[PDB]
Amino acid sequence: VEHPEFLKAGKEPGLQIWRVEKFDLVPVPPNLYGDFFTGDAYVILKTVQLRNGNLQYDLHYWLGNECSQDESGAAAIFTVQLDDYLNGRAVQHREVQGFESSTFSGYFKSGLKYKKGGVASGF
């Protein structure tokens, strides 16, 4: 509830992407949105503005084929914690490299792309 990135989460309609880095949630430079390191795990919050004026939330955690167990575990856990912080109103989606839902693919106009490498494991 006190994590700076939680405080920024879901305030406005849009797309927020964090990468797991050494057991923390670190915002992805917006210039890199759509390109995912296959060695890493990410958390993605899509916020949509409804006619109600309320906000709908969809949380995706994306797991790269070579990401390490601390990164995919942390991605799952952070997804739960962000949902809790959002009063439980996010729908959670597990996204595996190369088998992503069409909803998640649809967030990126240039399509999903993958890059070799990644940030080092916390383990």
């Binding site: 994590h3 057991f23 575990g73 799952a76 856990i77 439980g88 959670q92």
Partner: protein, 352 residues
């Protein structure tokens, strides 16, 4: 400040430091006290079984001897980790369906006997699901003393749907000891049980179809595999290699009326409402030492597929390191930048 992670197993305690990819201390959950009078724990107690009475303070994953459990935790902190418990946050695990009164007793002991500055109690199966990179799934956790099927949705276990089996690894060890009498082996003592446990782990496997495996194993000696006893004698085991773990699927082999592990997983999923069952069937996650048998995943997939509606997509996940997936999940969780917001501090507890 680095948290200590302790997984309180019926058979073995797993202990280490947050951020490590595996426990640095694994030792048997055994307390020995002099026969004619001091307490000895773990491996020390097994080597002095001649002068000690050995007890298991955790029965079926539930702490039932609190004085001896305190000896185990003391041993963990002082003799295994060499860590001051009063200077580290501690993540402790608990069994699914652990009564709230038990959790509160463990909390009282941590805060008032060991003076831990902060602690968190996590459900074992939930930690295993996180360690597999999932927030939704059903965890089949089979240890030494208890097996549980634990549905979990979006990070939280569904208590009404958890199901519990007293059938676990220790029963299979005892069953192997029994059926080895057909070949003339008389393992009976506590030390011989340890040897048989090792025979079980080295040579057993789960048949894809039990009846067919009985037939093919009868037609030649290819089934037979050897194992060198510590006294240098060689033992040969045949169809016992797959008949022993077959009890997981047919508890009647043990004189039990209970449902096997495939039926239990199916009943556990059925307790959850229809709209989330597909996510559970597609995320059956194996956890714990007694899920380590070769062939378990293919066999479980067959048997749950038979039982479940054919619209369901069955996926059994067998993580290579699943023997310690509980501890690894605790290591991840307690390394997170948000862990300090989840724990209970001594000051809060002492003023509650």
């Amino acid at each position: 400040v680095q948290a200590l992670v302790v997984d309180n197993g019926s058979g073995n305690v797993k202990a280490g430091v947050a951020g490590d990819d595996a426990p640095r201390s694994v030792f048997p959950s055994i307390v020995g006290r002099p026969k004619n009078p001091d307490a000895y724990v773990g491996d020390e107690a097994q080597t002095k079984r001649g002068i000690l009475t050995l007890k298991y303070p955790i029965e079926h994953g539930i702490v039932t001897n609190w004085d001896d459990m305190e000896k185990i935790w003391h041993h963990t902190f002082y003799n295994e980790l060499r860590a001051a418990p009063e200077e580290h946050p501690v993540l402790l695990t608990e069994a699914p369906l652990n009564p709230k009164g038990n959790r509160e007793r463990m909390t009282q002991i941590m805060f008032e006997s060991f003076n831990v500055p902060a602690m968190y109690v996590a459900i074992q199966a939930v930690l295993s699901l996180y360690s597999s990179g999932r927030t939704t799934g059903i965890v089949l956790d089979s240890g030494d003393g208890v097996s549980h099927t634990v549905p979990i949705y979006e990070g939280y276990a569904l208590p009404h749907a958890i199901m519990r089996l007293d059938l676990a690894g220790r029963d299979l060890t005892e069953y192997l000891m029994k059926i080895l009498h057909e070949r003339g082996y008389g393992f009976s003592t506590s030390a011989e049980k340890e040897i048989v446990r090792d025979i079980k782990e080295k040579l057993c496997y789960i048949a894809l179809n039990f009846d067919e495996e009985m037939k093919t194993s009868e037609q030649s000696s290819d089934i037979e595999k050897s194992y060198e006893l510590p006294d240098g004698n060689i033992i040969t085991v045949g169809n016992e290699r797959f008949r022993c773990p077959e009890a997981l699927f047919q508890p009647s082999f043990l004189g039990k009326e209970a449902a096997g592990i495939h039926t239990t997983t199916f009943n556990s999923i059925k307790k959850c409402d229809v709209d989330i069952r597909k996510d559970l069937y597609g995320n059956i996650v194996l956890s714990g030492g007694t899920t380590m048998y070769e062939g378990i995943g293919e066999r479980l997939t067959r048997d749950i597929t038979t039982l479940a509606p054919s619209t369901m997509k069955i996926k059994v996940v067998a993580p290579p390191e699943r023997k310690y997936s509980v501890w690894i999940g605790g290591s991840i969780l307690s390394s997170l930048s948000t862990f300090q917001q989840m724990w209970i501090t001594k000051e809060e507890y002492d003023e509650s």
